Scaffold this active site. Structure first.
Site, PDB file in Angstrom:
ATOM      1  N   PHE D  36       0.756  -1.268  -0.218  1.00  7.76           N
ATOM      2  CA  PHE D  36       0.108  -0.109  -0.006  1.00  7.76           C
ATOM      3  C   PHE D  36       0.785   1.279  -0.044  1.00  7.76           C
ATOM      4  O   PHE D  36       0.196   2.325   0.011  1.00  7.76           O
ATOM      5  CB  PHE D  36      -1.069   0.026   1.193  1.00  7.76           C
ATOM      6  CG  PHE D  36      -0.331   0.602   2.390  1.00  7.76           C
ATOM      7  CD1 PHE D  36       0.818  -0.219   3.127  1.00  7.76           C
ATOM      8  CD2 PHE D  36      -0.760   1.839   2.970  1.00  7.76           C
ATOM      9  CE1 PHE D  36       1.229   0.644   4.212  1.00  7.76           C
ATOM     10  CE2 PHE D  36      -0.020   2.315   4.248  1.00  7.76           C
ATOM     11  CZ  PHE D  36       0.674   1.701   4.765  1.00  7.76           C
ATOM     12  N   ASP D  37       2.096   1.145   0.280  1.00  9.75           N
ATOM     13  CA  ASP D  37       2.954   2.403   0.074  1.00  9.75           C
ATOM     14  C   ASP D  37       4.156   1.988   0.066  1.00  9.75           C
ATOM     15  O   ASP D  37       4.712   0.857   0.155  1.00  9.75           O
ATOM     16  CB  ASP D  37       2.789   3.180   1.384  1.00  9.75           C
ATOM     17  CG  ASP D  37       2.928   4.752   1.300  1.00  9.75           C
ATOM     18  OD1 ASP D  37       3.954   4.891   0.619  1.00  9.75           O
ATOM     19  OD2 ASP D  37       2.244   5.447   1.804  1.00  9.75           O
ATOM     20  N   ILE D  56       0.761   9.644  11.942  1.00  9.28           N
ATOM     21  CA  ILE D  56       0.383   8.956  13.060  1.00  9.28           C
ATOM     22  C   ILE D  56       1.294   8.314  13.861  1.00  9.28           C
ATOM     23  O   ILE D  56       2.548   7.964  14.033  1.00  9.28           O
ATOM     24  CB  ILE D  56      -0.563   7.500  12.469  1.00  9.28           C
ATOM     25  CG1 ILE D  56       0.505   6.768  11.541  1.00  9.28           C
ATOM     26  CG2 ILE D  56      -1.808   7.839  11.743  1.00  9.28           C
ATOM     27  CD1 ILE D  56       0.227   5.390  11.469  1.00  9.28           C
ATOM     28  N   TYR D  82      -5.601   4.309  11.102  1.00  7.32           N
ATOM     29  CA  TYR D  82      -6.891   4.992  10.728  1.00  7.32           C
ATOM     30  C   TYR D  82      -8.099   4.347  11.501  1.00  7.32           C
ATOM     31  O   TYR D  82      -9.211   5.343  11.300  1.00  7.32           O
ATOM     32  CB  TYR D  82      -6.869   5.142   9.327  1.00  7.32           C
ATOM     33  CG  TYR D  82      -5.758   5.764   8.543  1.00  7.32           C
ATOM     34  CD1 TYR D  82      -5.884   7.268   8.401  1.00  7.32           C
ATOM     35  CD2 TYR D  82      -4.685   4.968   7.912  1.00  7.32           C
ATOM     36  CE1 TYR D  82      -4.666   7.960   7.960  1.00  7.32           C
ATOM     37  CE2 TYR D  82      -3.556   5.538   7.507  1.00  7.32           C
ATOM     38  CZ  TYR D  82      -3.655   7.079   7.272  1.00  7.32           C
ATOM     39  OH  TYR D  82      -2.660   7.622   6.711  1.00  7.32           O
TER      40      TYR D  82
END
Lengths: 241, 175, 54, 107, 96, 451, 72, 327
Positions: D36-37, D56, D82
């Site tokens: 995802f990243d 975060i 999240y």
């Protein structure tokens, strides 16, 4: 405007009656209403009243002839065979839009498309299979997809008709709760937006998530550009909102 | 010989175009414009008179054969709408201004050059359109515009009747 | 600097400059857009469908 | 929490402080290994200070629990990430996370 | 105007009424009749004045008539007849 | 010689090595193939026309360009950023969250310091056409007004046609868009917002103070306005029955703003206009549908009766007749008081004076007699004592249409305005300083009765 | 369409009409491998056509009806 | 119902790895990195190479009509969604897709246009709208900006030259968001632009040689898939203003003394027309800039003639209306 008329004894002297013929090109206008409107209304009336649990052969249920009739209708609204020359193609598009919008003032918004949607009364084509004769839900696909395509290309057809499915968005929802014909909904969308987006302005999460639930059961319709990327964008000519 | 060479070179110039569907294009764009005064039709009329310009019989019979084949009614409806959409002197705006015409000349010149050379086919086809379902009488449509000019110019005279002399703007608007 | 010289030269362009020094284009461009120099082994000599026709 | 694991540590001493731009070249992941990243492919090392509440708190707590030159395998949770909202369009609701972190410098 | 009829949303008997509208309905379906003349042979004759015929409504399929109350109401084929459904033109407003 | 050599260089058909390439390769592509895809053959001949008509690129480029100094290159870049952000929200249309970006972009453009100092930018960039496109994309048709925030009208009216002190011709373009308002004649108010048609303010500001543009008007642009006023002929029943009185009751006003526009239509800077006033009177007179509470022939068409009838509705109760006593300076009281005040201000501004440029010898006597027939004009001396701003209109009727026995009927412009203005400049809690202007304005109305 | 009861009910002629597009002899037979208002003679090979619909009534492979139990 | 198809003959490989196995302990080594594209998707996965799809025509249509969706949601300005899509379709997938030669053409055009529609469809779309305005500030830079560099009246070259016009500006962000769309769309993150600038030129210089031979094998299927997305990427990069004069000289060297003379199909010609349009627009901007440079000193000299014979207007004597105004 509603100057109702009654046959007086002499009445007004200044009540002349000028005449207009259906001209050469309007022989088609004369032909459509005889061949395709009144007869279609009668046939669909017979089948619609018969679909309400009525004795079969007492009123018109001619399943030999209703299928042939809607096939002739689909042939009447057929597109103009793109390989043809320019002027013949454009004349056929003129005639097509005329016999579309001439159904329309007769009641595509009110009766004719309402007659097709009224003819969609089906619980299941399997459960009706052992009720009336031997055949109830055979050719739902033909009527549904084809004549809904005729309406959607009519709404295209005269450039300010976004009248029934965009207007009665409840009747668009009546499509979305069923999910067999995702090949006319996009014909509504990609012609609605270029005219003006009426359909897209109340559809919501509850519709798109149902379409996404369907999407697991698909291999990307191959005009997905139309349905989803016109739900978004209208092919480069958009409405931001 | 100068004049005759001019005529022949003009015919060669016109034949560069009317051998390539220019006339039919002209009639088509005029039929498309359904009575809407604009520049897109004005340039068309300039092209029409420029290709005709001396009673060219070839382009006349081409136009006429086209219209008798296609039986397009939009041409004559467009012309009769165009004449109604054409302008006159408008005395009131001249009164206000004390403190639209080239198009009309080019339109009627285009209408005249069809019937030049005493073309008896076009002269009758601008009265009846006998092959078609619907007819327009262009001739009366130009008589009506003649009335609408006569009334305006008589009114413009009556404004200037009792007065002594005429200014520059009044005489320009006259001419 | 000031824009009024731009509107000077806009009116200047039509009067002192815009003329047949470039308005002679109309006959030349049409005599060049007509011929159709080709050899398709079907034509009379040339003109498949010339550009002006297109 | 940040159940830190090490991969190839260095000094084990040069821990970060307040106002220190941790120059990271991380490579994030998701459970079931669905990436995802990244930062290795951009060739753009991340930069963030401590206590500024930019990131975060998982990355901040992982950096505070980390020395210089220390390749690692962090493991955050939905409580610090999240959450049940989830970052829209990328992260679904209630997702655990993996990060192949590698701190390089502090400025 | 044009001898229109109201729309089809009330299809049982409300379409037997009549209204006029000179708007966009001049072009469309409801504003269309047919001269079902009685003479079989030469039915496609050049029509002249003083010739009976029965009007028909194309979209609904119902013939025109005139009831006893002096008011116009359409009629099916079974109810029509030369008494009621028989009409013709007049050049001048004189009767003769 | 500088300019001549420059024109010789610029009009060298200058750079011909690119032009010889394009003009030959396009015709080659047309020669070697009968090509389909008409979007290609459009572009080919576009370029082929362009490379000869190089001057045509300049004639529609010099009107666009505009020079500035090195100091102004920061605020203008924020202006270009905002304008591009709006142009990306232009044909692509209204939006809910795009509303806020349109709002903030217009605010930043209003709070800029560029056209304060520069005389022609905002017209060349097409800002007015852009914003009018945004408005018609919002509206579309009637019955809805979905986005009820046209702050566009505030931009156009209260800044664009008032920045034209530097160059009046900004107003000319919005007057051309009065042809838009002809078809787009609209009824919605984003203000106090009862019913009063705030895009009408655009047409007002378009012809506020200009003899040229007001003369350039024409009769069908006013016929539909008086048709709307004729449509305003209906009775008052509830507190605020807009079209059904949903929950809130304060006040309806529908007819005042059309007359407030016609004021600017006929009345220029100083003396009025006859070319428009004559047709206005001739059009009002066919349908004088100012139907008040009850009088003969028409509904009202008489001021003291309707006004004294409505003061009973106004004084003890609220704006409504049956309502619990809430009303003062409420500009249903208003639209029945202020309506006829605006009507009278219009009619007074229409007509000329005796011993004017026309001393009643030039066809103005007809309209002056028509005015004189509506006497109640003699009897408005009662109304001149019975809001203070209502009566200045009737004073204007008298001063414009109308020996000293008639003066001495009143003996003054009015004893009570005189006394209350004498006493009101004495600082007190109540009955003081609300009339700091409301009766201190009456010098402007009374001093012309010097004579 | 029973026209004999013309006074009790009207008939429909628009669906009864027909048009004569062609008329030849039997020898006129080509298989592919006009004149203008010719007359009509006995023994000729005729062609009909419904007026408002273009369905040429012509020799086709109709083998359906079984009322008589041998008839087309 | 599918069936687990037991005969599955499709793409094997072309370049495996350049390993070596040396003795003295049986040493082995390789210093030549390679990588390839997988396929595994959260509603229907199928782990294969991307190049294993050119033989089957039921996943290709799916992937293509998903890439069109990706280009649709990030269309006409939408930055949050581009920040979302950058996780799925990160930079080196795009770089490998454009650089590869054996791909299908559908996915080639799709990945190219997906690069464009989340990198080069806000700034270019903006400045194309602001192109036809030609606003100028007056500085000393705007005065050595004449029509011709030299006195020979030589034809010049379009792109090389000083502009000095208030074109808009280009900002950027990173994917892990803060202030996702305030002023940031160079890319949705930052894209490395110089490598793309170089690789486009390299692909073009390879492609002219690939196409000149009339080869049976273009990159994807046919020559239109080869040239179309490459040229559109080159166009989008051209109208932004990245390219230096050193690059633009090479670009003109491609086609001036080549590509235009080559046989070509229609939709490539359609794009070459737009390139030529941009060149002519750049020339026109140079022309009006030279006009402004002239007009500065001209109007400064001409108002001095008014100052020479000082002549004046109404009672505010020697007001500034004498120079240039009418009110």
């Amino acid at each position: 405007i509603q100057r109702k008329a009654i046959m007086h004894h002499e009445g007004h002297m200044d009540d002349g009656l000028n005449l207009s013929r259906s001209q050469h090109e309007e022989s088609r206008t004369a032909r459509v209403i005889r061949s395709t409107v009144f007869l279609f209304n009668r046939f669909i009336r017979g089948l619609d009243a018969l679909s309400k649990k009525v004795k079969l052969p007492t009123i018109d249920l001619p399943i030999e002839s209703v299928s042939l009739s809607l096939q002739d209708l689909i042939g009447y609204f057929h597109p103009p065979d793109e390989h043809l020359e320019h002027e013949d193609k454009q004349n056929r598009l003129r005639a097509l839009k005329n016999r579309q919008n001439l159904f329309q003032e007769e009641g595509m918004i009110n009766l004719v498309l309402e007659c097709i949607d009224r003819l969609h009364v089906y619980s299941s084509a399997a459960h009706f299979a052992d009720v009336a004769g031997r055949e109830a839900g055979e050719s739902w696909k033909s009527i549904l997809n084809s004549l809904y395509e005729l309406l959607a290309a009519l709404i295209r057809g005269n450039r300010k008709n976004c009248a029934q499915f965009s207007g009665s968005l409840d009747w668009l929802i009546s499509r979305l709760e069923r999910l067999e014909a995702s090949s006319g909904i996009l014909e509504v969308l990609h012609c609605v937006l270029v005219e003006s987006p009426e359909a897209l302005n109340i559809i919501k999460e509850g519709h798109i998530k149902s379409i996404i639930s369907l999407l697991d059961k698909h291999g990307r319709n191959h005009k997905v550009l139309d349905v989803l990327c016109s739900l978004c964008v209208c092919h480069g000519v958009a409405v931001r909102s | 010989e100068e004049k005759e060479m001019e005529k022949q070179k003009l015919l060669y110039q016109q034949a560069r175009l009317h051998d390539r569907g220019a006339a039919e294009m002209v009639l088509q764009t005029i039929s498309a414009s359904k009575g809407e005064t604009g520049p897109m039709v004005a340039a068309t009329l300039k092209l029409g008179i420029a290709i005709l310009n001396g009673g060219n019989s070839t382009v006349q019979q081409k136009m006429l054969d086209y219209l008798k084949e296609k039986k397009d009614v939009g041409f004559f409806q467009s012309l009769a709408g165009l004449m109604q959409s054409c302008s006159v002197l408008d005395l009131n705006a001249f009164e206000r201004q004390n403190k639209d015409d080239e198009f009309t000349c080019d339109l009627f010149r285009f209408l005249q050059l069809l019937c030049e050379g005493h073309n008896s086919d076009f002269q009758n086809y601008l009265r009846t359109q006998t092959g078609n379902n619907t007819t327009v009488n262009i001739i009366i449509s130009t008589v009506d515009y003649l009335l609408r000019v006569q009334e305006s110019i008589s009114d413009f005279y009556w404004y200037y009747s009792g007065k002594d002399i005429i200014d520059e703007q009044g005489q320009r608007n006259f001419s | 600097r000031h824009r009024a010289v731009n509107l000077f030269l806009q009116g200047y362009e039509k009067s002192w400059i815009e003329t047949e020094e470039h308005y002679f284009e109309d006959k030349l461009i049409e005599d060049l857009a007509k011929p159709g120099a080709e050899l398709p082994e079907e034509d009379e000599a040339m003109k498949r469908v010339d550009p002006l026709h297109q | 929490g940040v159940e830190i694991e090490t991969i190839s540590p260095g000094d084990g001493r040069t821990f970060p402080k307040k106002g220190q731009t941790c120059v990271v070249h991380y490579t994030g992941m998701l459970q079931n290994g669905k990436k995802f990243d990244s930062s290795r492919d951009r060739n753009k090392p991340f930069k963030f200070r401590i206590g500024k509440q930019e990131v975060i708190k998982g990355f901040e707590e992982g950096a505070a629990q980390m020395s210089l030159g220390q390749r690692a395998k962090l493991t955050c949770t939905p409580d610090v990430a999240y959450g049940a909202t989830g970052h829209p369009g990328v992260i679904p609701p209630n997702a655990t996370l993996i990060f192949d972190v590698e701190l390089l410098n502090l400025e | 105007e044009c001898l229109t009829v109201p729309s089809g949303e009330h299809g049982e008997e409300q379409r037997r009424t009549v209204h006029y509208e000179g708007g966009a309905v001049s072009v469309h379906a409801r504003s269309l009749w047919r001269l079902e003349t009685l003479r079989v042979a030469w039915s496609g004759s050049h029509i002249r004045w003083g010739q009976p015929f029965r009007l028909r409504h194309v979209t609904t399929g119902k013939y025109l008539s005139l009831m006893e109350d002096k008011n116009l109401l359409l009629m099916d084929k079974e109810k029509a007849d030369v008494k009621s459904t028989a009409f013709a033109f007049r050049s001048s407003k004189e009767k003769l | 010689g500088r300019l001549l050599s420059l024109v010789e260089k610029v009009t060298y058909l200058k750079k011909s090595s690119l032009q010889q390439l394009i003009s030959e390769t396009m015709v080659r592509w047309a020669q070697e193939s009968v090509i389909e895809d008409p979007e290609l053959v459009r572009a080919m001949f576009v370029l082929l026309h362009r490379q000869y008509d190089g001057i045509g690129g300049l004639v529609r480029a010099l009107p666009k360009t505009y020079t500035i100094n090195g100091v102004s290159v920061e605020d203008t870049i924020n202006l270009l950023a905002s304008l591009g952000q709006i142009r990306s929200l232009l044909s692509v249309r209204m939006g809910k969250e795009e509303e806020k970006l349109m709002i903030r972009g217009l605010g930043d453009i209003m709070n800029n310091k560029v056209f304060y100092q520069h005389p022609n930018l905002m017209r060349a960039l097409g800002m007015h056409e852009t914003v009018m496109e945004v408005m018609v994309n919002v509206l579309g048709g009637g019955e809805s007004k979905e986005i009820t925030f046209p702050k566009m009208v505030a931009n156009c009216c209260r800044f664009l046609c008032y920045f034209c002190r530097i160059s009046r011709q900004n107003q000319k373009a919005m007057f051309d868009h009065l042809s838009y308002l002809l078809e787009n004649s609209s009824v919605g108010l984003a203000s106090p917002a009862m019913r009063g048609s705030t895009p009408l303010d655009v047409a007002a500001a378009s012809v506020m103070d200009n003899n040229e543009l007001a003369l350039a008007l024409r009769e069908p642009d006013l016929e539909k306005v008086v048709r709307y006023l004729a449509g305003c002929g209906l009775q008052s029943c509830q507190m605020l029955v807009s079209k059904g009185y949903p929950d809130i009751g304060w006040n309806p006003v529908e007819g005042e703003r059309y007359l407030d526009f016609l004021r600017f239509a006929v009345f220029c800077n100083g003396e009025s206009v006859e070319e428009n006033a004559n047709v206005v009177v001739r059009l009002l007179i066919r349908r004088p549908e100012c139907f008040g509470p009850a009088l003969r022939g028409e509904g009202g068409n008489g001021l003291l009766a309707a006004m004294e009838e409505a003061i009973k509705i106004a004084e003890d109760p609220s704006r409504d007749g049956p309502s619990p006593t809430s009303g003062s300076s409420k500009t249903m009281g208003n639209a029945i008081m202020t309506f006829y005040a605006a009507l009278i201000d219009l009619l007074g501004r229409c007509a000329p004076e005796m011993h004017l440029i026309h001393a009643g010898k030039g066809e103005a006597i007809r309209i002056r007699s028509i005015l004189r027939s509506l006497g109640d004009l003699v009897g408005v001396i009662s109304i001149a004592f019975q809001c203070p701003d209502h009566k200045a209109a009737m004073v204007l009727f008298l001063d414009r249409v109308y020996v000293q026995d008639f003066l001495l009927h009143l003996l003054e412009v009015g004893f009570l305005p005189d006394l209350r203005a004498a006493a009101s400049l004495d600082t007190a809690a109540l009955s003081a300083t609300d009339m700091a202007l409301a009766l201190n304005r009456y010098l402007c109305t009374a001093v012309l009765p010097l004579l | 369409e029973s026209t004999s009861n013309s006074k009790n009910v009207p008939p429909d002629l628009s669906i009864c009409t027909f048009v004569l597009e062609q008329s030849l002899s039997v020898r006129a037979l080509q298989e592919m491998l006009g004149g203008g208002h010719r007359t009509l003679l006995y023994g000729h090979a005729i062609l009909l056509r419904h007026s408002y619909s273009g369905m040429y009534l012509c020799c086709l492979s109709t083998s359906r009806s079984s009322t008589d139990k041998l008839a087309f | 119902s599918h069936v687990l198809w037991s005969r599955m003959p499709n793409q094997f490989l072309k370049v495996d790895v350049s390993r070596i196995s040396e003795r003295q302990g049986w040493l082995v080594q390789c210093l030549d990195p390679l990588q390839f594209m997988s396929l595994h998707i959260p509603e229907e996965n199928r782990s294969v190479d991307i190049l294993e799809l050119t033989e089957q025509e039921e996943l290709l249509q799916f992937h293509y009509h998903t890439l069109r969706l990706y280009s649709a949601v990030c269309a006409l300005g939408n930055h949050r969604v581009a920040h979302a899509l950058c996780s799925h379709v990160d930079e080196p997938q795009l770089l490998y897709a454009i650089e590869n030669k054996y791909m299908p053409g559908l996915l080639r055009a799709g990945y190219y246009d997906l690069l464009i529609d989340i990198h080069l469809s806000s700034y270019a779309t903006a400045r194309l709208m602001m192109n036809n305005e030609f606003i100028v500030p007056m500085t000393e830079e705007t005065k050595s900006i004449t029509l011709f560099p030299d006195e020979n009246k030589k034809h010049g070259l379009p792109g090389i030259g000083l502009s000095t016009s208030l074109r808009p500006r280009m900002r950027f962000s990173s994917p892990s968001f803060v202030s996702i769309s305030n002023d940031c769309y160079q890319y949705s993150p930052e894209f490395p632009l110089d490598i793309l600038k170089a690789k486009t030129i390299q692909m073009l210089t390879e492609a002219v040689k690939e196409g000149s031979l009339h080869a049976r094998d273009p990159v994807g299927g046919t020559t239109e898939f080869l040239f179309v997305p490459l040229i559109k990427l080159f166009y989008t990069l051209l109208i932004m203003g990245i390219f230096h004069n050193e690059d633009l000289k090479h670009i003109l060297q491609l086609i001036e003394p080549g590509l235009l003379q080559m046989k070509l199909p229609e939709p490539v010609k359609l794009q070459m027309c737009l390139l030529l349009q941009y060149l002519c627009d750049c020339q026109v901007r140079h022309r009006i800039e030279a006009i402004v440079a002239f007009s500065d000193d001209f109007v400064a000299k001409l108002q001095d003639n008014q100052r020479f014979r000082y002549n004046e207007v109404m009672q505010a004597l020697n007001m500034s209306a004498a120079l240039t105004a009418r009110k």
